[model samples]
Structure formats: structure tokens, C-alpha cells
Target: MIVFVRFNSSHGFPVEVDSDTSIFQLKEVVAKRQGVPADQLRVIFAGKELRNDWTVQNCDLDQQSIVHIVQRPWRK
Candidate 1:
């Protein structure tokens, strides 16, 4: 079972992704799909955001998780 979340963008784009995928992995996928860099991506969940070293398991992501993706405007 793949957890599909509706990630909306400022440009009115909603991307659905699997929960088993980690935030880092999701960033990579989003980068390729949206033409952005993983390092420049920011994934927001709950009421706070996550940084590197954040794990999907810790995030309680499985086949029934939902999350939001927001560009961190990372200048790196």
C-alpha cells in the first residue's frame, strides 16, 4: 500500500507521493519531476518542518501518511 499525499504548491500544483519514501528521497524525486534540487527543497509535516537526518520511519510514514512540500528557498 502506497501512501499518497496531496502536496500543493504556490502555483496550484498538487503532487501525490508514497509514504514509505523518505523526505530526502522525496526531495530527489521532486527535484527531477519539478526541476528543483533536493538540497533546495523543504518538506513540511505536522506543525513543524524537518531537516536532514529526518527519517520516514520516525515520521510515521507508511501506507497512510500525508505531507506537505514547501520550497525552503535554500540558497545552498
Candidate 2:
């Protein structure tokens, strides 16, 4: 499945992943692309935050789905 990860209203990217891909794994992909740590990244879909254990199929994601990626503030 291919999903769009929106960093903001004007910035986003496409990620091709398997239906069974876990949210943590998806975070890794987004993290790599965005140059951030996975632990600091949050994946939101349908007004809910996805858990690390959740899979794409588990989240009911489909082709061309849109997921929001928010990065947390860096710890001092």
C-alpha cells in the first residue's frame, strides 16, 4: 500500500509499504525521509494517534491514504 505522509499542509511525501507494516516501521521510513528520530515522530490518522504495534491493515489504511506526521520537540 502507498500512503501519503503529510508534514504540513504544503509539505508531504509518498511511502510505499505493505499492508501488514507496523506503525513503528512506518515511522522508521518517515523518520529516515524527514531526518528525524522515530521516537520523536507521531503518526496520526482519522483524528487518532496510531500505536507502534498497530499495522496499516489494522488502521484501515488504503491506497492513497493520508497520514499526518508530527515531530515532538527535542529534549534538552
Candidate 3:
């Protein structure tokens, strides 16, 4: 499955993964694309924050779905 992830309002990127891909794995993909860490990334879809333990199939994500990515606040 392929999904578009928007990190900012003006730009987004495409990610291709399997239906069984875990949210944590997806975060790792996005984090690598943005040069960040997976632990610091948050994935949101359908107005809800996705859990790291959730899989794409579990989330009911469709092909060409659009998800939002937010960075967690940095630790002091």
C-alpha cells in the first residue's frame, strides 16, 4: 500500500508499505526520510493519533491514504 504523509501543510511525501506494516515501522520510514528519530515522530490519521503497536491493516488505511506527521517536543 502507498500512503502520502504530510509533515507540513505545504508539502508531503509518498510512502509504500505492506498492509501489515506496523505504525512504528511506518514512523521509522518517515523519520528516515526527514532525518529524524522514530521515537520523536507521531502519525495521525482520520483525526486520531495512531498507536505504535497498530498496523496499517488495523488502522483500516486505504490505498493512497493521507496521514499527518508531527514531531514530538524535544526533551530538555
Candidate 4:
């Protein structure tokens, strides 16, 4: 079971993440790709925020489930 999510950034570039991996690993990938703060990123699924230590198994992710990524914005 693989979860896919698409996001429209504030620029020409878009973002898509694959849940075929762990929440922690994916977050690091996104952080490196998008230059987002690793500690400030959160993976949202099942109407809840998940920690970096969580994996797909921890959340019971399946073909019928959907996962999304929501990272914190830069603060002044």
C-alpha cells in the first residue's frame, strides 16, 4: 500500500511525497529537498499530527488510507 500526496507551493515548483516509506524518513527527504526545518515538519494523517519517530506501520497505513505533509512556515 502506497500513499501519495500533492502540494502546490507558492512558486512554479510543486511537491509530492510517497508513503511507501516511514514518516521519519520521508520528513528528512522533504526537508532536504524543500529546505524545510526538519524539527518543524509534521506528517498529517487520519486527522492527526504524527511524530517523526512514527512509521507507516505505527499509523496502520494501507491502500485505503491517505497521508499528507504539512510543514511549518518560517517565522520572523
- After the best TM-score superposition of candidate 2, give how far the Cα of residue 48 lies from its true spot, in angstroms: 1.7
Q: In lDDT terms, how accurate is model 2?
A: 0.74
Q: Which digits, one per residue and each the tens of the lDDT, describe model 3 over residues 1-76?
A: 7777788533776678888898888888878777776676777888787777877766765543678888874861
lDDT of each: 0.58, 0.74, 0.74, 0.58
Q: Write the per-residue lDDT of candidate 2 for residues 1-76, one digit (tens) a residue.
A: 6777787533767678888899888888878776776777777888778777877766765543677888884871
Alpha-carbon runs more than 4 Å astray in model 3: 63-65, 73-76
Compared with the true structure, the alpha-carbon lDDT of candidate 1 equals 0.58
Per-residue accuracy of model 4 over 18-67 as CA lDDT, tens digit each: 44566688668767877777787766667776665665554654433555
- Residue pairs in clash, model 3: none
Q: Which regions of candidate 4 deviate over 4 angstroms?
A: 8-21, 57-62
Q: What would the TM-score be for candidate 2 when compared with the true structure?
A: 0.76
Query: What's each prediction's TM-score?
Result: 0.53, 0.76, 0.74, 0.55
As for candidate 2, its clashing pairs are none
Question: How big is the positional error of residue 62 in model 4, measured in Å on the Cα after superposition?
Answer: 5.4
lDDT winner, 1 or 3: 3
Which model is ahead, 1 or 2, in terms of TM-score?
Answer: 2
